[PDB]
């Protein structure tokens, strides 16, 4: 048995900032503080203006990234679970949910700009972190990319759901996991944009 009247309800994912890539410089902006975030998570009502392609998102327990591609705001399942995302009209239910791919997706919020899938097949990739780092990545497989310079896994923590981009800024994939050997990250694993387009069809 269970006491249903006391049964808690998980809050919504909340947009708390963005990675600005419109100008010549990449920098992160915070659009909502902790206090406002928690109330927005429980209300599901977020009246703030949304801009850009790469959002910073947070639950009450985790913070990560979400990327807009082909009208869908994508993130990772292990960060968002099955949660709604806050919006001006209230909590918005997931349009896509695939745990096998560690992928979820919502309707892209009004005011967001979607990235266009990459069609160049370039090996030179670039990972956008939550700190607005643009890290070069050499593509090694369908869902793998090698870090030109190995880093502590710390620097990539909280960047799942962020994008791997082509040289033209086209979306190549969604950062999902890291190839870690005892604390260091040598490569990254990502959801290919073609796997996104497969899920959408």
Ligand X SMILES: CC(C)(C)[C@@H]1NC(=O)O[C@@H]2CCC[C@H]2OC/C=C/C(F)(F)c2nc3ccccc3nc2O[C@@H]2C[C@@H](C(=O)N[C@]3(C(=O)NS(=O)(=O)C4(C)CC4)C[C@H]3C(F)F)N(C2)C1=O
- Is 160 catalytic? The answer is yes
**Is-contact 174 118, C-beta < 8 A?**
no
Residue 179 interacts with which of Cl ion, ligand X, Zn ion, none, CB < 5 to 8 Å by class: ligand X
Q: Is 185 one of the binding residues for ligand X (CB under 6 A)?
A: yes
Sole binder of Zn ion in the list 38, 170, 184, 189 (CB under 5 A): 170
Instruction: Exactly one of 12, 46, 58, 102 is catalytic; name it.
Output: 102
Q: Is 102 one of the binding residues for ligand X (CB under 6 A)?
A: yes
C-alpha–C-alpha distance, residues 179 and 5, integer Å: 43
- Is 142 catalytic? The answer is no
Distances (CA, A) of 120 to 36, 125, 142, 175: 41, 11, 14, 19
C-alpha–C-alpha distance, residues 115 and 169, integer Å: 8
The residues with which 185 forms a beta bridge, in sequence order, are 151, 180
Residues near ligand X, by CB under 6 A: 62, 64, 77-79, 99, 102, 153, 156-160, 175-180, 185, 189
Residues near Cl ion, by CB under 5 A: 101, 191, 195
């Amino acid at each position: 048995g269970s006491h249903m009247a006391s049964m808690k309800k998980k809050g919504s994912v909340v947009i708390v900032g963005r990675i600005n890539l419109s100008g010549d410089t990449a920098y992160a902006q915070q659009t909502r503080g902790e206090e406002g975030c928690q109330e927005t998570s429980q209300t599901g009502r977020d009246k703030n203006q949304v801009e850009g392609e790469v959002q910073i998102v947070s639950t009450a327990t985790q913070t990560f990234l979400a990327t807009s591609i082909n009208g869908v705001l994508w993130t990772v399942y292990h960060g968002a679970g099955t949660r709604t995302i806050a919006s001006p009209k209230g909590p918005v239910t997931q349009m896509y949910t695939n745990v096998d791919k560690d992928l979820v997706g919502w309707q892209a919020p009004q005011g967001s700009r979607s990235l266009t899938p990459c069609t160049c097949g370039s090996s030179d990739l670039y990972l956008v972190t939550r700190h607005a780092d643009v890290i070069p990545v050499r593509r090694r497989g369908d869902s793998r990319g090698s870090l030109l310079s190995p880093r502590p896994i710390s620097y990539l923590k909280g960047s799942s759901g962020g994008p791997l981009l082509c040289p033209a800024g086209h979306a190549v994939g969604i950062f999902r996991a890291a190839v870690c050997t005892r604390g260091v990250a040598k490569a990254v694993d990502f959801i290919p944009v073609e796997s996104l387009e497969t899920t959408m069809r």
